[PDB]
Amino acid sequence: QVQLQESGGGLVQAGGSLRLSCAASGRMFSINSMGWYRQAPGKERELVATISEAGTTTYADSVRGRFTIARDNAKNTVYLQMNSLNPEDTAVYYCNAYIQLDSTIWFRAYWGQGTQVTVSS
Amino acid sequence: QVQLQESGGGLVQAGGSLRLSCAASGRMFSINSMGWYRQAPGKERELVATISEAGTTTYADSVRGRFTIARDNAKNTVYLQMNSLNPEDTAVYYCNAYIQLDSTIWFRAYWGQGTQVTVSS
Amino acid sequence: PFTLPNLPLSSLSNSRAPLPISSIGISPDNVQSVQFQNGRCTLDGRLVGTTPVSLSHVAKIRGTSNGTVINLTELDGTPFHPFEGPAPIGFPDLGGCDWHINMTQFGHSSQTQYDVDTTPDTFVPHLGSIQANGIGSGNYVGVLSWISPPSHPSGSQVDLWKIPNYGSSITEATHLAPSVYPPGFGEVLVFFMSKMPGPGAYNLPCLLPQEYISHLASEQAPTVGEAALLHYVDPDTGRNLGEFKAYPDGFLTCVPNSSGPQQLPINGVFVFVSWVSRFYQLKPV
């Protein structure tokens, strides 16, 4: 089965930094873009950063400059470095990947269990 | 062939009267509503009066009281009696009928050749 | 040898619109003959009217609009030749209602609802032209999506037992497929019904399921008789649920017994028994 395992996250003071990682495992045929999403209680899930198989990146306007997304294509692992954090960055972060199960089937979006990020003030 | 032939019309001084008739001929199965429409220069074709097979009447607000629509079902002829004509009544008048060609077929709208009515000034 | 498809009616389609068959019915008392132009095929596989072989052509239109008129062609884009038929193959034949056709394009995005009144003088499908009624210029393909009460005559109820007037002052001018009449002696026409979307309990009748038509056109069986005696068989048990007659022109009849053909189950199969005379008297269902 397809599995996404996240590491990192936690508590940090305002202005500090945190790093997130998420590894993709399981039987699959192809993997496209991987990325990070976040959702605070009472709000909807929003995009944080995306990285393609080639390395083309997309960032949310609220995190441009502060966040940095990286990817190890050989290990199917996506990395997120968050700098200059504010208390409004407090949410549950989810890694995401579009994976092709077989040559005959189209892609599907898969999600990780979610990592809590708490920024104090 | 189904044909609608109009008679009447012509020139008349303002305040005078004219009568229009419309005869329906040809092989047909049924005739629903019959009516009169007109088109003045610079305008679109507009409803004047309609009469059903039962005898229910509809009149345009602009002719209520002055015009009268009648029908002799036995002759498939609809009549329009125009009284108290004014210069706004100057138009080309058209007879209209929804006719069933056969028992199995739905209605179709048929028109007469058009009769000119001119009110002097 | 003559055969009918060994398939339950509940799994087949209507021949006047791409809709599944949901019931067997008979016409109301006030409906004698019918002149459907779609769903017409002889027992030896000759298509009549505007009937196509496949359901992918049923209740569809194709043409080029210029903002005011839609000039029709055949569904494959070849020109429609008038006086060879009442309309291009597959053209809708639903009278007594307003048409709402979903139009799409090859090479372009989006879909557009095309609202068709079949009574105005603009509606002349037999000459290859129908009013655009707001559809912008371009080439389109459309399929009937839903129906509504006819706009004219105002207040008239939906009547799907009729075909529209294809644009003529003389019936013979449109070269329609001939009407179908009940043979008499208690025999009534059998219709295959489908539920049609729209603001009402619309039931679309047809004379033959579309799968019957492609089967007959494929088999081309010599009509070695004047009428085909059929059995409506429950496929699970095999019990005969009623005697039916299929006439060479391509329609089914029966003799109803309140309890009749409309109360018959829809998961049955019509089976050819033997060739009989046109006057063979059926046992009531």
Add this chain to the structure above:
Amino acid sequence: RPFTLPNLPLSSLSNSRAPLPISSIGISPDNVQSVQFQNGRCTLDGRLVGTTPVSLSHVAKIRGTSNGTVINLTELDGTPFHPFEGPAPIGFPDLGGCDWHINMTQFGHSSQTQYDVDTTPDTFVPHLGSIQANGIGSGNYVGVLSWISPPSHPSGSQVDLWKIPNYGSSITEATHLAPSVYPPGFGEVLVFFMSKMPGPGAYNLPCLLPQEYISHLASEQAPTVGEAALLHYVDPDTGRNLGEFKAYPDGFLTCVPNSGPQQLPINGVFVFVSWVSRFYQLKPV
């Protein structure tokens, strides 16, 4: 019961993955080996596979109840859908590598609504009977595929109709798909029946069997007394054999290209010649 194929020209038949007429014969690109279409799957003895329906009036359709957020699907006749007996309800669209635009109508209500379907999100779980409403208001609907567009995800990907969608699982076997079809090799390649699909592009929808072939096979139920059926693609006007073909029991056609099958005319008829071994070597087309 002797095996037969419909005596109808291909140009008069329909696609089995959408209600579209067949416009060409083709082969897959070099980079396309196997295909796993869930619609248009029937064995030579008339056993339907995947989500394939008997009639085209069920092809590429959906039915369910929306609550504003999800559409709970049923079977097209309104009966409940039971998960884990197949990847989706019978007739559900199987077009991967694109975004779906489905025309939704209702029984008893007016108007039609375009339903925009992304087949990649976690909400898209047709094998469990639930797909995202994506703005469709609460109510009961019946929908049919109207046109397609490039898939939203992966962003920028080109339309690829050689694929089926993921029916909502992390494990391939969990959705109980119809098994993949592979080219047999040794010069034999799979034969596909193509149709033009509306949308902003030159979309060609391939399928393994015309829908009329499927209803014919399901009706005939002819015993597959061989490992392969040798066919001739015959010009009905001339009677001339235009090429040798093999039909395998699982329900697909192959041939040996010479340039090849894509240059063959579409007005021909496939005729069964005899039962042959799976190792019968065909003459190049």
